[PDB]
Amino acid sequence: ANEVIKCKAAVAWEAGKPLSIEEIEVAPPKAHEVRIKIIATAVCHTDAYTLSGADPEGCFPVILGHEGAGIVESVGEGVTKLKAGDTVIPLYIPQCGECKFCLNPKTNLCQKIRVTQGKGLMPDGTSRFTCKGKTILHYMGTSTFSEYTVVADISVAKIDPLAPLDKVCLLGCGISTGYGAAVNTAKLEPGSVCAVFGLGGVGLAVIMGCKVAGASRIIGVDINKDKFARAKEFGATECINPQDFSKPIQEVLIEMTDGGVDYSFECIGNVKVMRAALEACHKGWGVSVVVGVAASGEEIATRPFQLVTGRTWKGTAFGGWKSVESVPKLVSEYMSKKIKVDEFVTHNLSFDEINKAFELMHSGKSIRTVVKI
Amino acid sequence: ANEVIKCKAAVAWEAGKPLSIEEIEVAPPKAHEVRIKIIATAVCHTDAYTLSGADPEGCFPVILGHEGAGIVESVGEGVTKLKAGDTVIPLYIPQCGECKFCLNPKTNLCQKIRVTQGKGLMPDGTSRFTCKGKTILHYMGTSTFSEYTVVADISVAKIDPLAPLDKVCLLGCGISTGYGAAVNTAKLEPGSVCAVFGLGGVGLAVIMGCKVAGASRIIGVDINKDKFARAKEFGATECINPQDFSKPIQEVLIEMTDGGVDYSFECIGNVKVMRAALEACHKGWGVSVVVGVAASGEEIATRPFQLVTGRTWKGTAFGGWKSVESVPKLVSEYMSKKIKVDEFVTHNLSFDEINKAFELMHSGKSIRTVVKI
Ligand SMILES: NC(=O)c1ccc[n+]([C@@H]2O[C@H](COP(=O)([O-])OP(=O)(O)OC[C@H]3O[C@@H](n4cnc5c(N)ncnc54)[C@H](O)[C@@H]3O)[C@@H](O)[C@H]2O)c1
Ligand SMILES: NC(=O)c1ccc[n+]([C@@H]2O[C@H](COP(=O)([O-])OP(=O)(O)OC[C@H]3O[C@@H](n4cnc5c(N)ncnc54)[C@H](O)[C@@H]3O)[C@@H](O)[C@H]2O)c1
Ligand SMILES: [Zn+2]
Ligand SMILES: [Zn+2]
Ligand SMILES: [Zn+2]
Ligand SMILES: [Zn+2]
To answer: Which residues carry this modification: N-acetylalanine (chains A, B)?
Structure first.
């Protein structure tokens, strides 16, 4: 492309300050990039973190957002997999397909863009987001909170065009992560007992995952009781509340399964609940997965005896999926009714009232606020 | 059997006090037990712990020892797998073959005798070791520091009779553990980089394991430099000393492999070196195994990011081997020259001078002191 699209966007000028809708100048695709016309974007706890200012590495001003879905407005020099009009989903973990991590089947962490993406710039150390002369930094390689964005050649996952754009976008984060957390990482086995700590979005995708995997007793765990209904609806055979007892939560779970759960996923991001989750697993074979990100400096811990008695401690990023190859498939899984997606959108908003989304989040009302652009 | 054998043994009357050779009355086999004539027994750091008195659960007086090998003096009512004259090796982890843990291929932790063994008694809550009227408690189900011992039906692994009894006994502990730590637990893959923290006995069996497994760069790590020669002899391509640098050991290992080791085993039993080992593994797929037992209350820890970036934390008991089925096979592996064993015996002693073994241990001179009974 050549022309400079001027459009609407939700810039975040200074941390701690509400996203100000703004007009911006989205430059045209440089070699191996694609400009995407957003059609829907949701809000995640992740976006909240950066805006919160607590993100130690959160440069501003930045056009946040990563759960998006849209049409390709145009491609840059040297691109071939995409074309103007293709229905896509940007991704925050690329799949260059030729790096040390992309060539290995044990991980999905493509490093080819790690450092440039980190500095809120494109693969050439520059941004495409101009505004009133000032330079706005891209965010997580996606920058969905914009009518038009510019992502690198390798961050796009082309998808089914008849895919409800205002829904499939939840596959660029929460859903996938939790689905893979049960399907990829843990590689859960039919008939196994499980326990899910944290019944928000990510947690729900895990309960879903355990089900399609064919579990036999998924146990949801959350402090806020309101989360219980959808949990049980999604597959959870039971739901308990830590606050409801005097014994430590691990001691409760154990008694309930005479030994411990076979698998256990921590989807909150609370170190104290992380070691709690691990210690609730069964002796000799219990496995624990960390799906929730944590605060800088917070560190997990436990007595090594746990691991010596036979307990594996694992973690996961984007549920394991090699982005570009997987996302497209997940959409099929959706269309063919194998997995749920709409069930996650608890609220719809209009672009103008973007800030409202960050508002319902702070109240434990939402599972995923979807915003029409 | 019926007669009460009166013989020599090394009783430990009170913690902190040197093992006093003594005459004792070893009662005859009760149903489903076997009396074993010891012919050789070695000394392990484990035995030191109990005697040290620091073992929170170390009831006295006790006839310690677990690395033994001998001939079956006689069997008790209801036994059939053994007979007077069979060459055997007692084990501290049984294989009842029908419990919740024995029936599952993910672990080797037979629980059928856990509580009784713990109280230093036989499966019927009584001991076979009488002495000057007093009751001496059995230790780890084996009690090898005795001319004659009594172990339960399920703690015996029948072996190759032409097996050098004064050597194969090292398979009842250190060797197996470390071999399996690389072969079973980690299931190491041909061509992989590795790092071994602690070059004592257990550590050496891991270096051995990584080799037969077909590694590609085993890195030994120890504080005491004297351990380096045998390490390199066993398979280690290089050996480094933590104390030799100013950077944290993890930071050193990383630079040496441009990323990290693929696998990493901690064989010391030092929590600080445990998180150190884990953090030295490679991003996205690195795996860490805890083979070393630790002090009561000491707890491992790290930032969850490690696990989220793709790092598995594992632990192991007896290297994974389902005792009774495996031990016999390991002996074959020995005889058929597939694995080393003699290379571990750095000192031979006579029963009378048993205490000397605990002495060389306290000096980092030994890898395994073998004692002829
Ligand atoms: N590792 C990754 O790749 C990855 C990817 C996406 C999201 N995440 C992270 O996963 C975590 C989950 O995010 P989310 O999107 O699901 O939404 P969320 O914030 O809505 O989920 C929060 C849930 O945890 C519950 N909770 C809080 N304290 C609890 C406690 N002490 N015990 C039990 N439950 C408790 C809250 O009540 C709520 O139910 C976050 O840390 C997010 O950053 C990680
Ligand atoms: N998990 C199990 O099933 C199992 C089984 C058998 C033994 N073990 C345990 O494994 C561990 C190893 O025992 P061992 O028999 O091999 O003999 P050991 O005591 O001789 O090995 C000690 C080695 O660790 C080294 N070391 C000490 N501090 C170090 C440090 N800070 N950094 C690097 N190296 C250091 C010592 O110098 C020595 O080389 C012990 O804890 C033992 O109890 C565990
Ligand atoms: Zn998100
Ligand atoms: Zn890549
Ligand atoms: Zn031992
Ligand atoms: Zn058993």
So the answer is: 1
Resolution in angstroms comes to 2.7
Q: Which of A36, A328, A345, A323 is nearest to A161 (CA)?
A: A328
Task: Please tell me the experimental approach by which this structure was elucidated.
Answer: X-ray
Question: Do you know the residue count of chain A?
Answer: 373
Instruction: Report CB contact under 8 Å: B285, A104.
Output: yes
* Tokens coding B345: 């015996």
Q: After which residues is chain A broken (C to N over 2.5 A)?
A: none
Question: Phi and psi of A17, rounded to 5°?
Answer: -105, 135
Which token pair is B86? 């069979």
CA distance A110 to A323: 9
Task: Give the closest residue to B195 by CA, choosing from B115, B250, B118.
Answer: B250
Interchain contact, A310 vs B315, CB within 8 Å: yes
Query: Does residue B241 contact residue B197 with C-beta atoms inside 8 Å?
Result: no
Q: In chain A, which residue's Cα lies nearest the Cα of B291?
A: A308
Domain that holds residue A247: 178-316
- A281 and A337 part of one domain: no
Q: What share of residues in chain A are helix, strand, coil (percent, to 5)?
A: 30, 25, 45
CA distance B4 to B74: 12
Beta bridge partners of A218: A194
CA atoms within 13 A on the CB side of B333: 16
CA end-to-end span of chain B: 22
Residues of chain B contacting A, Cβ within 8 Å: 100-101, 104, 106-107, 109, 259, 271, 274, 283-285, 290, 293-294, 297-317
C-alpha torsion sign, points A93, A95, A98, A102? positive
User: Residue A134's domain is classified under what CATH number?
Assistant: 3.90.180.10
